[PDB]
Amino acid sequence: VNSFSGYLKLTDNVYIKNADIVEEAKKVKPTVVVNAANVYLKHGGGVAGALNKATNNAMQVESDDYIATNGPLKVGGSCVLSGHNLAKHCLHVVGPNVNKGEDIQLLKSAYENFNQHEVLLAPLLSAGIFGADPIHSLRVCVDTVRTNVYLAVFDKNLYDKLVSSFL
Ligand SMILES: OC[C@@H](Nc1ncnc2[nH]ccc12)C1CCCC1
Numbered sequence: 001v002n003s004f005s006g007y008l009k010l011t012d013n014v015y016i017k018n019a020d021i022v023e024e025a026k027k028v029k030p031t032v033v034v035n036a037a038n039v040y041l042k043h044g045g046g047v048a049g050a051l052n053k054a055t056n057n058a059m060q061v062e063s064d065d066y067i068a069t070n071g072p073l074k075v076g077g078s079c080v081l082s083g084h085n086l087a088k089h090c091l092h093v094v095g096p097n098v099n100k101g102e103d104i105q106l107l108k109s110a111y112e113n114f115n116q117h118e119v120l121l122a123p124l125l126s127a128g129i130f131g132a133d134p135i136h137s138l139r140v141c142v143d144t145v146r147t148n149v150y151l152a153v154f155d156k157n158l159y160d161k162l163v164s165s166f167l
């Protein structure tokens with residue numbers, strides 16, 4: 001039993017809700033919140049910009065030190081950093097950005113990072129400003145993640161479309 005509330009159950013392990021991931025994280029304070037990161041951990045917009053703003057830029061400060069030490073992530077890769085005031089940990093995961101010409105096949109690799117954590121609050125990877133089809137991202141999530149994932153879909157119209165089209 002966990003403290004996530006109001007989610008629709010899609011499969012044994014995948015759950016979904018129309019919600020602002022920032023507001024959800026502040027309420028639940030989950031062990032792991034997933035950020036829709038880029039390889040430079042530059043949290044400018046989308047989920048990343050919103051999560052970073054909610055940390056008063058502490059996420060960005062921590063991320064800049066991470067990059068200065070380690071260099072950029074790989075597309076499809078991840079790193080674990082602090083969750084600041086939002087969660088215990090933030091799993092920064094880089095899905096492919098179609099608006100950069102990156103290989104959508106890497107979306108499965110990106111979701112595989114979730115399997116290293118028993119429970120996560122997450123957005124749909126590569127959706128929104130990363131330019132992939134959210135219906136496809138949900139299919140990849142369900143077919144790749146085996147741990148317990150609570151998906152927050154900001155857009156209500158998109159949320160309704162994902163449920164009604166879910167196979
Ligand atoms: O990952 C892309 C995802 N974006 C967010 N998800 C959850 N919370 C969010 N807060 C700010 C942006 C954001 C899109 C939202 C509708 C479909 C995918």
Ligand SMILES: [Cl-]
Nearest residue numbers: 046047128129
């Ligand atoms: Cl977005």
